[PDB]
């Protein structure tokens, strides 16, 4: 009996298949989150600066109140 190297292909490994595809981001939907984070960013920040004004006037009031200084 002769024994040589046997042939096997099975699945053929798929000859040239695309793996690159669009994922997560679509296009217009990313701008809704992108610019949406900006509008949420300013509104949250400016409310803190209005709360800073409560401290600001109260800080300068200490100088006016102190005349024996």
């Amino acid at each position: 009996x002769x024994x040589x190297x046997x042939x096997x292909x099975x699945x053929x490994x798929x000859x040239x298949x695309x793996x690159x595809x669009x994922x997560x981001x679509x296009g217009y939907s990313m701008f809704a989150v992108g610019i949406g984070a900006l509008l949420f960013g300013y509104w949250s920040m400016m409310k803190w600066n209005r709360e800073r004004r409560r401290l600001q006037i109260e800080d300068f009031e200490a100088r006016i109140a102190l005349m024996p200084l």
Binding site: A37, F40, G41, S44, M45, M46, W48, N49, R50, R52
Partner: protein, 296 residues
Amino acid sequence: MINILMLIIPILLAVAFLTLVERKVLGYMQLRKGPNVVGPYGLLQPIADAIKLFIKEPLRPATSSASMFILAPIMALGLALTMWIPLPMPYPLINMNLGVLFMLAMSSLAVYSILWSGWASNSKYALIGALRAVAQTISYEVTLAIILLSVLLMSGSFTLSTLITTQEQMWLILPAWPLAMMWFISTLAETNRAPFDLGPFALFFMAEYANIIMMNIFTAILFLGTSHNPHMPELYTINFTIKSLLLTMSFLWIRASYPRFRYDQLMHLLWKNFLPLTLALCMWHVSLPILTSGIP
């Protein structure tokens, strides 16, 4: 005054122990094993590099022009270490009258470190490439000043201590969404060797990697904060280090993942494209405290 030595010696160790991080984290990116033979996980190698280069390694200068070449590493290491002083941290060492102005000044003078090295070599062959390396740093410092001002004009004065207090509930990444993207790129121009790349030669490594940590920390003040807590210094110290370490991973991410942008097209990304974008956002950031009340 003992705290200055407690901000040079552990910092020089941080630049030394970077050699582990700069090729093990970079290693797993490239599927290779970094340090392993030298130590238990290679912890003995960072200090072993110091014994190799400082003591035994001799000098062979090209011409040695009296004062220069043995003055350029002093300007390199000196300016890199003095940048640690104005840093806000939980508590700053000798807090300046204005914070960020000192930060931009010592970085703009750090351009000299690569300038005097070009003058050290007598040959014309080296100085053309040296001036090209100056152009990589000098150009991005124009925008670096602009993006800084837009963050400052939103909230707080130049003082770095006030920048922690303004970030009480939400980070500055969300209001400054395109500006946060800029600080990931603009910082890499200062000899990081990720978008563009050009004894005493070993001392330049200890200075250039020191600026990498410096830009990681400075981004974690302008954009990160989470909490302040004056009563508990324990909670701030741990939480600040993790935020800075995550930015250190992103600095080594660009070095491995992305090729060089070319020197000519580095001036097409910036100047041609970035400078119209940064100033348009600067125009936007002038109107913001006027449109809605936002003055420190």
